[PDB]
Amino acid sequence: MKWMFKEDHSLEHRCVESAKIRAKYPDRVPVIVEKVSGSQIVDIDKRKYLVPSDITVAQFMWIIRKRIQLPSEKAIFLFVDKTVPQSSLTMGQLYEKEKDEDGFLYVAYSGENTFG
Amino acid sequence: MKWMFKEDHSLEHRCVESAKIRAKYPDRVPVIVEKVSGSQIVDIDKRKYLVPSDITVAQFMWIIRKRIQLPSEKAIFLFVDKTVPQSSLTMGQLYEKEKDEDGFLYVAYSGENTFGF
């Protein structure tokens, strides 16, 4: 995926921003959230998240679902890098496993791969 | 294998359907998913998918697993042109590499390795 956050900020800028935020909040996970490019699902208003390291991926998934008010019947999927994060991991664990070199964790989301 | 999608639609019909959808959504790939004929695994409720080109094969595989609600403990094998597609390729790349001449990418799935040991 090609992230708008990276298109909007240079590596230098992002590297420093995450360094500042993490130093300030050592027990929180800084996450950049964007909808999969071209996906049909509605976009999201908030892109930057700073969550306690203990919440699970499943709980983070709920935060995103709530943010876009996606109906229970409609499925939502979280993507990190080239795979799907295991819902049981804590965001702190996902951060250590998948953090970008810039210090942020990048999570993409999408809905159902409906047709025409 | 014999694909029900092809049994139900002529080559002409299929070609036009994908042409229209690709023109409308250049950043999505039309995919047909069918269970390996005679396989034990449960059948799927949806056959046609329009997938964002940037998600990976591994991510799409998960979407299918969720569609049939198969416990992660049970195995799922995807096959394209009778081979397991490499999981790190994006669906867009898999499409360009393995798309049918009719414009659709055909993905088969089974609970057992049909074309492997």
UniProtKB/Swiss-Prot annotation, chain B:
Listed Pfam families: ATG8
GO BP of this protein: autophagosome assembly; autophagosome maturation; cellular response to nitrogen starvation; intra-Golgi vesicle-mediated transport; mitophagy; positive regulation of ATP-dependent activity; protein localization to endoplasmic reticulum; protein transport
Domain of life: Eukaryota
Covalent lipid adducts (Phosphatidylserine amidated glycine), residues: 116
Matching InterPro entries: Atg8-like, Ubiquitin-like_domsf
Annotated localization: Cytoplasmic vesicle, Autophagosome; Endoplasmic reticulum membrane; Golgi apparatus
UniProt KW Endoplasmic reticulum keyword: yes
Recorded GO CC terms: autophagosome; autophagosome membrane; cytoplasmic vesicle; cytosol; endoplasmic reticulum membrane; Golgi membrane
Modification sites for Phosphoserine: 39, 87-88
Lipid-modified residues, Phosphatidylethanolamine amidated glycine kind: 116
Keywords: Acetylation, Autophagy, Cytoplasmic vesicle, Endoplasmic reticulum, Golgi apparatus, Lipoprotein, Membrane, Phosphoprotein, Protein transport, Transport
Swiss-Prot/TrEMBL site (Cleavage) positions: 116-117
Residue numbers bearing the N6-acetyllysine modification: 24
Tissues where the protein occurs: Ubiquitous. Expressed at high levels in the brain, heart, prostate, ovary, spleen and skeletal muscle. Expressed at very low levels in lung, thymus and small intestine.
Job description of the protein: Ubiquitin-like modifier involved in intra-Golgi traffic. Modulates intra-Golgi transport through coupling between NSF activity and SNAREs activation. It first stimulates the ATPase activity of NSF which in turn stimulates the association with GOSR1. Involved in autophagy. Plays a role in mitophagy which contributes to regulate mitochondrial quantity and quality by eliminating the mitochondria to a basal level to fulfill cellular energy requirements and preventing excess ROS production.
Family under the similarity heading: Belongs to the ATG8 family.
Subunit structure, interactors included: Monomer. Interacts with ATG3, ATG7, ATG13 and ULK1. Interacts with TP53INP1 and TP53INP2. Interacts with TBC1D25. Directly interacts with SQSTM1 and BNIP3. Interacts with TECPR2 and PCM1. Interacts with TBC1D5. Interacts with TRIM5. Interacts with MEFV and TRIM21. Interacts with WDFY3. Interacts with UBA5; promoting recruitment of UBA5 to the endoplasmic reticulum membrane. Interacts with GOSR1. Interacts with KBTBD6 and KBTBD7; the interaction is direct. Interacts with reticulophagy regulators RETREG1, RETREG2 and RETREG3. Interacts with IRGM. Interacts with DNM2. Interacts with NCOA4.
The protein's name: Gamma-aminobutyric acid receptor-associated protein-like 2
Organism field: Bos taurus (Bovine)
High-level lineage: Eukaryota, Metazoa, Chordata, Craniata, Vertebrata
